[PDB]
């Protein structure tokens, strides 16, 4: 980066996601002026972030254990996915943490 911050004078940084707004001055070693974040002023809820830590078995889940199978975790995720597929209208996404993870998971879901 250093050459551009050297060359240009007035630069901007913008994203719908940046956080925290101090790691970037640290890593990139550059001077800022206005490090502001904007709040979604909504007259309505409009979206429902959640943290589904425990499946039906009330068991803590993740991908952290391995890149592997542990049929408890697999069955838990599969239940999650299928009930969502029942409930949401057209259009849904998922984001597995890594490709091999998806390969194994879906293979043995099809199992």
């Amino acid at each position: 980066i250093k050459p551009v911050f050297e060359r240009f004078s007035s630069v901007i940084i913008t994203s719908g996601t940046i956080s925290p707004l101090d790691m970037y001055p640290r890593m990139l070693n550059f001077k800022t002026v206005l490090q502001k974040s904007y709040a979604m002023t909504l007259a309505k809820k409009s979206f429902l972030p959640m943290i589904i830590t425990k499946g039906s078995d009330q068991v803590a889940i993740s991908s952290r254990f391995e890149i592997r199978n542990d049929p408890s975790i697999v069955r838990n995720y599969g239940s999650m996915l299928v009930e969502f597929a029942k409930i949401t209208p057209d259009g849904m996404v998922v984001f597995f943490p890594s490709y091999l993870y998806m390969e194994s998971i879906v293979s043995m879901w099809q199992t």
Binding site: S56, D57, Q58, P71
Partner: protein
């Protein structure tokens, strides 16, 4: 005996009167009517929290009556233990029941509910180095373990050992409560004495079954396949019996012939340790197997 009568003590707490019993002031504004002397819960249609009240009653007790207008309540010692293991707050549950139930909360019933909320299904049995010890996550469990004749007197002062927890776990206390808390190691002789004391002094401990800590038992020739049939009551019973993390030995009444042994097979595979199966008769054993 090594068992406590309270498990089968259900069938009491149904009797009252009108002179000593006063009209519940909440009777004027009470969506339900929890009859304490009779142990009943007359949850009429006026209750707006009827689902939650029924869930709480079924946890703590056995709802005998479920009429179209109002429900009924029955007392069950096993039901009391199940409610205690449910995990709901005792004081908050009592307050909610008093608010919804028009009848005032009875003294004896309130005391039983308070005892079941903490003591019932909430005993403390600490573990050190992945074994069974005399301690508790809560303060009461540690005091009981220290004052326990077998837990304390038979428990070595060493807080925890990995090898002692694996081998000796005052016997191998694989049926102890949650480990990794303030506790001390115990020997490998007399779990019979420990459970006898627990049932005699009425200590319902939230036991587990640390199968991976059963270092003495090699993992038997078990094929951990859940491909056998699974049923809603079967799976919910499995969820209840496995508890938290490690499984636990428990009692579940099941419809015989309706896949009763399926959950047992699943749990036996889950623990991956030495398990045996018993049916009624040897001919019935063969019939069930086939």
């Amino acid at each position: 005996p090594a068992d406590f009568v309270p498990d089968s003590v259900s069938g009491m707490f149904r009797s009252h009167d009108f002179s000593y019993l006063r009209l519940r002031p909440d009777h004027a504004s009470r969506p339900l009517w929890i009859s304490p002397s009779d142990g009943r819960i007359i949850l009429e249609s006026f209750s707006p929290l009827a689902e939650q009240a029924q869930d709480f009653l079924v946890t703590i007790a056995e709802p005998i009556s479920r009429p179209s207008h109002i429900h009924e309540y029955k007392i069950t010692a096993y039901s009391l233990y199940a409610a205690v293991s449910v995990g709901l707050e005792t004081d908050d549950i009592i307050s909610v029941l008093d608010r919804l139930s028009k009848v005032p909360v009875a003294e004896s019933i309130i005391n039983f509910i308070k005892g079941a909320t903490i003591s019932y299904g909430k005993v403390k049995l600490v573990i050190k180095h992945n074994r069974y010890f005399v301690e508790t996550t809560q303060a009461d469990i540690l005091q009981m373990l220290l004052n326990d004749s077998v837990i304390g007197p038979l428990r070595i002062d060493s807080d925890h050992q990995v090898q002692p927890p694996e081998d000796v776990l005052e016997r191998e206390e694989e049926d102890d409560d949650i480990d990794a808390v303030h506790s001390f190691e115990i020997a490998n002789e007399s779990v019979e004495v420990v459970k006898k004391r627990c049932q005699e002094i009425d200590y319902p401990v939230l036991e587990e079954y640390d199968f991976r800590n059963d270092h003495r038992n090699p993992d038997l020739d078990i094929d951990l396949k859940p491909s056998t049939q699974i049923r809603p009551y079967q799976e919910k019973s499995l969820s209840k019996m496995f508890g938290n993390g490690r499984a636990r030995s428990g009692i579940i009444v099941l419809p015989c012939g309706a896949g009763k042994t399926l959950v047992g097979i699943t749990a036996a595979c889950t623990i991956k340790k030495s398990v045996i199966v018993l049916c009624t008769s040897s001919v019935s054993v063969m019939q069930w197997r086939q």
